[PDB]
Write a protein that binds this ligand. Structure first.
Ligand SMILES: [Zn+2]
Ligand SMILES: [Zn+2]
Ligand SMILES: [Zn+2]
Ligand SMILES: [Zn+2]
Lengths: 173, 173, 173, 173
């Protein structure tokens, strides 16, 4: 296995600001733990963050959120990115759509994505879908992901994306 | 509005054959009804059908199904395509991934996709996501789509893709 | 016609710095003129600039150039982007690959791309190619584009991408 | 190295039929030679053939050619595909655009594409670009490719895509 960690939407507006929830806050400790081990082990860490324009397709659905330029779209300080970490702006749910995520994964010979962040129903899941199409294996760190609407999310990942589910305190590296 | 109809995985495998959902049969009369009205009105009809190779990414998850060359991957006779419905082979959940769906829709000036077929909560849903990404409006025909795992699938479409839900017996054309 | 202006790689390293040429310098006046008219007319202006990582595929070919973070990848001051202009980072020759260029064009209902910048042999041409695949019409402003290796570039655009060639002092708006 | 052979537009239209280059005939013996060695060695062989609709973007440029359903879009008998060579229909210059080429290459763990067919300076070249974007190494077989407009095509491949150029009678397998 050669994995990269993809950290989805761990940004101020969903953790600290206007759309903050406790489910979201609960992810921060575990996320820092997962991020830290990947770094200490030299493997790629990639942040993929909403950085929306007013006319992005999904703005009609949600209204303005995690806008480009506004501090809402910035990664929370708790897991501030370091030198060597990749930071990507995205305009749709999936971390792959309109981004160079796939490039970075291919350039570092990656065959497995480890997914954490916000959230199990929308962006994490959508990123997972695209990973599958592109023949990556998928791992999700349950305690580092927050649900929104679906309580059967874990089941969906496993049954539909063949994902294996782990906890932050586990590490196959 | 200028819509195209995208007919997802109405193949023998998902209807009559092996992986068929129980309510999957019930979509066939509504699907024929929707397809017919689109045809009678000159608008594009596109069939997107799993046509798998043994090493497609999702084979490890589901095992062999709707394989290229085998009759399981063939559109059911009830709604046999005419010339010139478009018939596309796909290798992943989304009707857009690795296909020329978007080309067809762009070439015919389309701004709205009308979605029917199987599964409501998998291929139809993954087709909807990629439609949203590409700035198409989305319509799902509730009685021409079959769910598999999620019973809250209608809610997901509307809340996550801003889709509007219609019945086969309705027509805004 | 509803056009957007795509301004390719008008960045310091190719105009002012390490890979500066007079062909390149010659584009600046005309580019400012084209950019200005688009702005004065409310139509979208999109800068697409190399912002490379060390391991981008093309770095093996060219060595480091227009690197992310370094002033070489910054747009020249002469045509500094304004409020409302879009500024995109790209990692390959085409302005579309791994970017949200197509999103912006679709969100603003665009059907024609007007191409200027660096250069007619590589990035402008590659961007043109992708525009074609995505069913845009193509216009190139000859005096606002610099050749590198091919002297028959104008012929290639017209014969292969069906591009129409204009001069900066002309305007169909 | 783990290579796949991509065989571009060796169809009746480009060889025997209407738009055929004069030296296009001369590629057929080398192409068969390259194809045969790949087969004898178990490596993937993928045919990518124009299979146009009347409203594909390039029809306005070239007029009708290599149309879907017409024998002009059929692979020449000299190098008839076997089972299981992959045979892909494409609608644009690049063998990647709107196709599942990348899926096949990824599923077979490929890191290098070997390119033959027509035209050296159009479809073969546009296939090379998209290969570079996707971090594949590139090999062109000079005698199994035919130029159309540009006589400096070999130089373009090497200088712009870092391609290495080989003859059909050579084999690094
Ligand atoms: Zn968002
Ligand atoms: Zn399937
Ligand atoms: Zn570059
Ligand atoms: Zn063609």
């Amino acid at each position: 296995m050669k994995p990269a960690l993809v950290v989805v939407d761990m940004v101020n507006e969903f953790i600290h600001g206007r759309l903050a929830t406790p489910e979201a806050m609960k992810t921060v400790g575990p996320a820092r733990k997962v991020i830290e081990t990947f770094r200490r082990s030299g493997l790629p860490v990639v942040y993929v963050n909403d950085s929306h324009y007013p006319d992005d397709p999904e703005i009609r659905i949600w209204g303005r959120h995690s806008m480009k330029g506004d501090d809402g779209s910035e990664v929370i300080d708790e897991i501030r990115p370091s030198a060597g970490d990749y930071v990507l702006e995205k305009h749709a749910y999936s971390g792959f759509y309109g981004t160079n995520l796939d490039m970075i994964l291919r350039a570092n010979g990656i065959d497995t994505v480890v997914l954490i962040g916000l959230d199990a129903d929308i962006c994490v899941r959508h990123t997972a879908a695209d990973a599958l199409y592109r023949n990556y294996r998928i791992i999700v760190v349950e305690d580092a992901v927050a649900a929104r609407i679906d309580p059967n999310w874990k089941d969906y990942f496993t049954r539909v994306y063949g994902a294996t589910v782990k906890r932050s305190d586990e590490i196959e590296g």
